[PDB]
Amino acid sequence: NGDVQIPNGDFETGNLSGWTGWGGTIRDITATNAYEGGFAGHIKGAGAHEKEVSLRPNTQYVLSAYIKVASGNIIFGIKENTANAQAIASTTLNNTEYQKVELSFTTGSETNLKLFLFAQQATDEGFGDNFEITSLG
């Protein structure tokens, strides 16, 4: 039903397999601060957790994930997987308990996108589990 498969978007394998990213004073999985199952993602410092997704062109999709912010602000969004990365959508979170975040977005002709969970500073730290992308129509 339009639901796109995101390998280990639940972090339920226990490791960061199927995920990428850069930097971070903490870029690791977490068991104590999961939203569902045994694990979730953990980011802190200057870095981000990122994932490559392959979607159909010119389609409306919903990007959703559960996210808890420990300090500062966490940038949840998706962008094109190219240089001069065109950020399709994003949101700036500071909610301290786990909440569902949903971003409506539309793909252009680029099919190769990259979601991210981004902490710009060390004062920024949070977690995200249950990453999902579904096609609306």
Say if residues 6 and 64 touch (Cβ distance below 8 Å).
no
Give the resolution to one decimal, in Å: 2.5
Partners of residue 44 on adjacent β-strands: 26, 125
Q: Which amino acid is at 111?
A: T
Give buried/exposed letters for 43-66 (b at 16+ CB in 10 A, else e).
bbbebbbbbebebeeeeebebbbb
Report residue 127 CA to chain centroid gap. Answer: 10
| Experimental technique | X-ray
Please give the class, per CATH, of domain 3-135: mainly beta
Say if residues 77 and 111 touch (Cβ distance below 8 Å).
no
Nearest to 85 by CA among 96, 93, 77: 77
